[PDB]
Design a protein around this ligand. Structure first.
Ligand SMILES: [Mg+2]
Ligand SMILES: [Mg+2]
Ligand SMILES: [Mg+2]
Ligand SMILES: [Mg+2]
Ligand SMILES: [Mg+2]
Ligand SMILES: [Mg+2]
Ligand SMILES: [Mg+2]
Ligand SMILES: [Mg+2]
Ligand SMILES: [Mg+2]
Ligand SMILES: [Mg+2]
Ligand SMILES: [Mg+2]
Ligand SMILES: [Mg+2]
Ligand SMILES: [Mg+2]
Ligand SMILES: [Mg+2]
Ligand SMILES: [Mg+2]
Ligand SMILES: [Mg+2]
Ligand SMILES: [Mg+2]
Ligand SMILES: [Mg+2]
Ligand SMILES: [Mg+2]
Ligand SMILES: [Mg+2]
Ligand SMILES: [Mg+2]
Ligand SMILES: [Mg+2]
Ligand SMILES: [Mg+2]
Ligand SMILES: [Mg+2]
Ligand SMILES: [Mg+2]
Ligand SMILES: [Mg+2]
Ligand SMILES: [Mg+2]
Ligand SMILES: [Mg+2]
Ligand SMILES: [Mg+2]
Ligand SMILES: [Mg+2]
Ligand SMILES: [Mg+2]
Ligand SMILES: [Mg+2]
Ligand SMILES: [Mg+2]
Ligand SMILES: [Mg+2]
Ligand SMILES: [Mg+2]
Ligand SMILES: [Mg+2]
Ligand SMILES: [Mg+2]
Ligand SMILES: [Mg+2]
Ligand SMILES: [Mg+2]
Ligand SMILES: [Mg+2]
Ligand SMILES: [Mg+2]
Ligand SMILES: [Mg+2]
Ligand SMILES: [Mg+2]
Ligand SMILES: [Mg+2]
Ligand SMILES: [Mg+2]
Ligand SMILES: [Mg+2]
Ligand SMILES: [Mg+2]
Ligand SMILES: [Mg+2]
Ligand SMILES: [Mg+2]
Ligand SMILES: [Mg+2]
Ligand SMILES: [Mg+2]
Ligand SMILES: [Mg+2]
Ligand SMILES: [Mg+2]
Ligand SMILES: [Mg+2]
Lengths: 271, 46, 93
RNA sequence: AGGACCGAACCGACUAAUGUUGAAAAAUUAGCGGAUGACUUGUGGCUGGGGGUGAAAGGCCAAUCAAACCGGGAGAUAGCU
RNA sequence: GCUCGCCGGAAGACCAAGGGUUCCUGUCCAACGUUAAUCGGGGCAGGGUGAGUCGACCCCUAAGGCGAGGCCGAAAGGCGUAGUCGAUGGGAAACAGGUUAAUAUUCCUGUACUUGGUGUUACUGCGAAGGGGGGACGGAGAAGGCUAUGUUGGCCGGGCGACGGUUGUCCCGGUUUAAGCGUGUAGGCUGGUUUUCCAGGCAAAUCCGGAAAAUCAAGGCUGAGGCGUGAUGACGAGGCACUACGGUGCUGAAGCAACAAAUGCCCUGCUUCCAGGAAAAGCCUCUAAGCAUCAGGUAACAUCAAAUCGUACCCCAAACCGACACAGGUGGUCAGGUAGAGAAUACCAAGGCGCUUGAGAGAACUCGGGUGAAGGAACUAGGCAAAAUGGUGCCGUAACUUCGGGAGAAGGCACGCUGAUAUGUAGGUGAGGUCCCUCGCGGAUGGAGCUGAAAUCAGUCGAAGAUACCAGCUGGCUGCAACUGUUUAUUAAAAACACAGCACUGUGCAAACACGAAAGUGGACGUAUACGGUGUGACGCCUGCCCGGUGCCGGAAGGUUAAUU
């Protein structure tokens, strides 16, 4: 539930937060945790290859089951938990043989629900099936691209994919971005949409909130000198140039996709 | 006012010590040059 | 076991000083200059065999040489080891 | 509760006087700003010169920066003094 | 040596870094010390640093480094797997008293503790490179219980006062005691136990996880402090006697209680929030190969071992970084009294200092301060500077507003001391005694003693009672930037940068993009509610017309058009 903060200070006036009473309040499940140290946008050369990354709160990685390959053994949801590593929430499920797993929390799931994966799983939110066994027109998430590889599409909060057609060894998906794409019918998908659809309604409110999430400030190209940006220079505010990246490529409309290997799987572009 | 030299023996040895110079071939060329000049103190090591 | 050669090499000299004298007269401790690489056990065994006393325990420290001056020349004396070794209150070597 | 308020430590540096062969190659004195945060600080580590880093002043990269320092081409060239 | 002055959240004491003999003793005064020097961090010579428990080394890992093979690269090399290193973090153990000119948790006295190896014994399933538990972790906030520590009383020793008084409700001083061991408390957390079964834990498992019965309804873990002991000990004001008047030997009373109380401990707890908060080993537990009247494991006892290196001294400084015995800089710890909210501030305690040129004089002028008749911004670019305000409680407080603010708006009143209320009150603490229960660090009752605000009324002194130090000037109109932040280290702090928010655009994942001849790596162990680029810059009302020029996007009938042939 979204909540508007009260303007008791200038930094709180515009804060809109997402508050979920069902998220677990205790510590996460330790055996499914591991460290993940921060990079600051630096590669193995030590150089900044992606700007504006650094700082933020320490985080532990949660090993989430994207493969959903433990077929035919029902599992029970034990709780919903906060995940700092992604926008969606995750659910701790307990299988009937005693094994516990994290899965992405779909919409409408709560403690006590039963999920199941496999060819013979029922058509219910949270159940994983190969898309050959999912009715045309269904809404799915955590969609595989290669069979057995793991879910890679429609993973962020509130996302989902529509199965528009099924002809032969391939199905046609309408991706969240809006392009039509083909994928092998043996690729698995989870029924329903990702939960936490109110995530996009949050308003950070202040600069420090964005600093908490490891984002460093962005300096405008027009505000610097010509020696370090094509937009730089000028006596007063001057532009007189076609907008470009810090490396001189046009940055308003020029297309950058060049992949003829995968062009065959793209039925229609997002537009 | 804080001046430029802030001594740390461990950092000195790791930056300029005998084993640091021997690590790379350019450091070994540094050692060879200083041997050819006849330097009494080859490195900062001691 | 330590050979006779090592035990014969590990004792250098008796240290003589006012603190050494008071240790002699107050704690039945003798103060010795010993080999730089000499261990506590080697010193104990050497004192027991080459002086024929019973040794309670040996305490050791390393003395640093002083940087001296011999007419504008920068010299440095050598480090050396000193052993405080006490006897079993019945020997008085 | 709070990039909340007043205010020491701590971090900073708005005004004035002094000092300007200084006590000091940037300080002192009286005031001044922040002071649970985009805070501050210790230890260690990583990024290297047309390169790095930069909440961007062409700022900083060992009192050196519109291209560091050391050595070399090198006795560069100098219709100039 | 007697006075005087200064610091005392330091200008005292102690760790780490850094330095390296500057430490102590004797001797000397050339040079060094901004003067003299008999003095010195100066010269010269000698002396001085004692560890199973402190630290390093050691075991373990972070960031990161290196890296057998490997992948890549004209060469040089680059990256990286298995591995191996790398603390600023995890891992066993000691305290008190005494002692040197110079060391001490290291020496001595007393009293403890940890780990390992051997030998004898009683038994006994042991075994890892594997599994599981544990170690193991954020911010803020709140109270309770304590302790360090202080105050006062009691007690012990001493005193009866240079000038009026001083046998008392008088004055000075002391009234200290560890680790360990035993007790398991204020408090926190968790339901135990026994069976049976099971697609999980790379194989196995009696261990973990899961499921179902029965049974008890309590078992366990954690835990400051207190009490006992350690301790009839040590320490102890003082007092006897030498002395080299530097010090010494010896003896030694009281050694209790109440109150107050930490930012330290319980507490790695509890409550709450979102930004969701290391790793590995030590440790416990389970088995695999394997071994089997042996090796091995547990308990007991005895014996042995615990090496090596550091340890002086400075350490907010004359010994470190600043060329200097330089108004600079330098991480952590300790934290007394009175007044005070306080680690502010004033005066002090312990403790440490008077800053390595002095002596006169009492011109101009410069520096840093005090006071000023009448006027009161007339000064000046400008109230620059100075002057002024300044506390607590209570009363009261406008436009505007995003309803939080504006606001400490503005403005005003009281404020010392004495007595009474009330031989000391409201409150806090709390003894004895009385009663009871699974008798204990228990409960209940009970109120002695102790400590103790604030207020009201009456009186009273001064020019003045927030009397010193300390400690907002206030209001009105307007430009700019929403705001907290950031910046030209060393002439610019701003209206500049950033910002939350907005929009455009790219990007389907081996993503775009970026560093890379490459291998790879970041983006991201993220997947379009995501990520990169660009411009704008909270919020409110909004954001009109032009595609001729240039750029970008789409198209391909035609014209022109490379290599090649
Ligand atoms: Mg960005
Ligand atoms: Mg932005
Ligand atoms: Mg500029
Ligand atoms: Mg350019
Ligand atoms: Mg202009
Ligand atoms: Mg123009
Ligand atoms: Mg040098
Ligand atoms: Mg030693
Ligand atoms: Mg604030
Ligand atoms: Mg303040
Ligand atoms: Mg600054
Ligand atoms: Mg100042
Ligand atoms: Mg403020
Ligand atoms: Mg400029
Ligand atoms: Mg510079
Ligand atoms: Mg150039
Ligand atoms: Mg030439
Ligand atoms: Mg020339
Ligand atoms: Mg000397
Ligand atoms: Mg001295
Ligand atoms: Mg002189
Ligand atoms: Mg000397
Ligand atoms: Mg000993
Ligand atoms: Mg490598
Ligand atoms: Mg190799
Ligand atoms: Mg290691
Ligand atoms: Mg490594
Ligand atoms: Mg460490
Ligand atoms: Mg000393
Ligand atoms: Mg007490
Ligand atoms: Mg605090
Ligand atoms: Mg010492
Ligand atoms: Mg100084
Ligand atoms: Mg001086
Ligand atoms: Mg500092
Ligand atoms: Mg003070
Ligand atoms: Mg005068
Ligand atoms: Mg004057
Ligand atoms: Mg005046
Ligand atoms: Mg007067
Ligand atoms: Mg006047
Ligand atoms: Mg007047
Ligand atoms: Mg007037
Ligand atoms: Mg005027
Ligand atoms: Mg005028
Ligand atoms: Mg002023
Ligand atoms: Mg004033
Ligand atoms: Mg104007
Ligand atoms: Mg502003
Ligand atoms: Mg500001
Ligand atoms: Mg400047
Ligand atoms: Mg300035
Ligand atoms: Mg990739
Ligand atoms: Mg702008």
């Amino acid at each position: 539930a979204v909540v508007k903060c009260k303007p008791t200070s200038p930094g709180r006036r515009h804060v809109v937060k997402v508050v979920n009473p069902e998220l677990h309040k205790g510590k996460p499940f330790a055996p499914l945790l591991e460290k993940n140290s921060k990079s600051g946008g630096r590669n193995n050369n030590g150089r900044i290859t992606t700007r504006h990354i650094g700082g933020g709160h320490k985080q532990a990685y949660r090993i989430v089951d994207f493969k959903r390959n433990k077929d035919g053994i029902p599992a029970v949801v034990e709780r919903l938990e906060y995940d700092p590593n992604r926008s969606a929430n995750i659910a701790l499920v307990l299988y009937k043989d005693g094994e516990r797993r994290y899965i992405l929390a779909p919409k409408g799931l709560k403690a006590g629900d039963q999920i199941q994966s496999g060819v013979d799983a029922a058509i219910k939110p949270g159940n994983t099936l190969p898309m050959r066994n999912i009715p045309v027109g269904s809404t799915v998430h955590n969609v595989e691209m290669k069979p057995g590889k793991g879910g890679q599409l429609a993973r962020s909060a509130g996302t989902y994919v529509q199965i528009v057609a099924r002809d032969g060894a391939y199905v046609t998906l309408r991706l969240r971005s809006g392009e039509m794409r083909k994928v092998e019918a043996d690729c698995r998908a989870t029924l329903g949409e990702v939960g936490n659809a109110e995530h996009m309604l949050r308003v950070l409110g202040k600069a420090g909130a964005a600093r908490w999430r490891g984002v460093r400030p962005t300096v405008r190209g027009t505000a610097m000198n010509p020696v370090d940006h094509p937009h730089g220079g000028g006596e007063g505010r001057n532009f007189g140039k076609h907008p470009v990246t810090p490396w001189g490529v046009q940055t308003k409309g020029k297309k950058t996709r060049s992949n003829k290997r995968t062009d065959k799987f793209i039925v229609r572009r997002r537009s | 006012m804080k001046r430029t030299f802030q001594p740390s023996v461990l950092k000195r040895n790791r930056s300029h010590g005998f084993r640091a110079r021997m690590a790379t071939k350019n450091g070994r060329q540094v050692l060879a040059r200083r041997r050819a000049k006849g330097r009494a103190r080859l490195t900062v090591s001691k | 076991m330590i050979r006779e050669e090592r035990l014969l090499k590990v004792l250098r000299a008796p240290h003589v000083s006012e603190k050494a004298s008071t240790a002699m007269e107050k704690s039945n401790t003798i103060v010795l200059k010993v080999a730089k690489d000499a261990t506590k056990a080697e010193i104990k065994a050497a004192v027991q065999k080459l002086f024929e006393v019973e040794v309670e325990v040996v305490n050791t420290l390393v003395v640093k040489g002083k940087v001296k001056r011999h007419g504008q020349r920068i010299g440095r004396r050598s480090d050396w080891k000193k052993a405080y070794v006490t006897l079993k209150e019945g020997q008085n070597l």
